[PDB]
Amino acid sequence: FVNQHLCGSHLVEALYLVCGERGFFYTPKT
Amino acid sequence: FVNQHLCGSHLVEALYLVCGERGFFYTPKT
Amino acid sequence: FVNQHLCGSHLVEALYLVCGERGFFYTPKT
Amino acid sequence: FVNQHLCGSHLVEALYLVCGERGFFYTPKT
Amino acid sequence: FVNQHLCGSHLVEALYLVCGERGFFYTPKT
Amino acid sequence: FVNQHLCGSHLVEALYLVCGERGFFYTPKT
Amino acid sequence: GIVEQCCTSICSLYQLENYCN
Amino acid sequence: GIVEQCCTSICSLYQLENYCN
Amino acid sequence: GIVEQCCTSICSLYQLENYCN
Amino acid sequence: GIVEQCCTSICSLYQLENYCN
Amino acid sequence: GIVEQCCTSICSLYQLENYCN
Amino acid sequence: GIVEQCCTSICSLYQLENYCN
Ligand SMILES: [Cl-]
Ligand SMILES: [Cl-]
Ligand SMILES: [Zn+2]
Ligand SMILES: [Zn+2]
């Protein structure tokens, strides 16, 4: 595919895309 | 605040707004 | 909840979320 | 431009693009 | 990656993420 | 309408809006 | 209104523009 | 769960907040 | 206004409710 | 086509990738 | 191109139509 | 973490899969 900068919403939407039904965690504190 | 009807990526967007820097976990059934 | 920077689209989507059926005004000139 | 089928937050996104710095009011029924 | 159910603008968002700097063409029927 | 800065996703969503059924190409290399 | 018409039927950007400030 | 309830029915921001870290 | 309050600066979901109708 | 298949059925990121430039 | 016209610079909805098929 | 990997820096769709459950 590619590499881009993915931040906030944009970043979340990507995780939603990539993970979908598996689910995912967004943990910006780390 | 008002109640929400959210499907798909629109649920992840809401979680994003609601949780902020705390982040969140997205965990659908199956 | 939290506080974040909410700008343009992101800002509008938030207002949509928070206000929903009440409706809202986005008036950036002020 | 073409005609549009817009529900939910996708209507607010369109208003955002269309109105720009003028801003807009979002006023649903009930 | 998982399979996707994407309508409307959510298809263009996916294409955007998937293609990156390569860009893409969006070509619906009719 | 107006003129604003439209970048990435935001830019794509706009093209989707303006072009819809005609379809469109997003070709950032140019 | 506009909110319901764009969803249940179709609407134009020109009709949208009427809701700008 | 929450994912299904917000879509098939309705959900609140307060119920959403339970899924924050 | 909203832009200064929520974009240039930082705002809560409660401040955002100041712009509802 | 792809536009209709992702909506009416399901589609993969790998099939999406075919529409990149 | 589009990025320079609409992101780096500023573009109208009419300029955007230059990229439709 | 994710923010440093994918926002501050640059990440692939494959790196993003590191954050799925
Ligand atoms: Cl942005
Ligand atoms: Cl939708
Ligand atoms: Zn949608
Ligand atoms: Zn954005």
Side-chain angles (χ1 to χ4, degrees), chain A residues 9-10, chain C residues 9-10, chain F residues 9-10:
Chain A
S9 49
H10 302 304
Chain C
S9 49
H10 302 304
Chain F
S9 49
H10 302 304

Side-chain angles (χ1 to χ4, degrees), chain J residues 5-20:
Chain J
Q5 175 207 334
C6 295
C7 187
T8 67
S9 65
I10 61 164
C11 71
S12 72
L13 301 185
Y14 293 93
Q15 293 165 329
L16 291 194
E17 198 183 17
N18 294 328
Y19 297 72
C20 307

Side-chain angles (χ1 to χ4, degrees), chain F residues 1-7 11 14-15 18-19 22-28 30, chain K residues 1-4 6-21:
Chain F
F1 304 75
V2 289
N3 307 8
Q4 53 188 49
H5 286 100
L6 292 173
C7 301
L11 179 48
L15 285 175
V18 159
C19 299
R22 310 174 260 191
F24 65 84
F25 52 99
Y26 172 60
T27 53
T30 265
Chain K
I2 202 180
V3 171
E4 290 78 45
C6 294
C7 173
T8 300
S9 187
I10 200 198
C11 75
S12 63
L13 271 27
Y14 307 86
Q15 296 159 259
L16 283 163
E17 286 192 296
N18 294 326
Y19 314 92
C20 300
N21 285 332

Side-chain angles (χ1 to χ4, degrees), chain I residues 8-21:
Chain I
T8 300
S9 187
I10 200 198
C11 75
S12 63
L13 271 27
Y14 307 86
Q15 296 159 259
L16 283 163
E17 286 192 296
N18 294 326
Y19 314 92
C20 300
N21 285 332

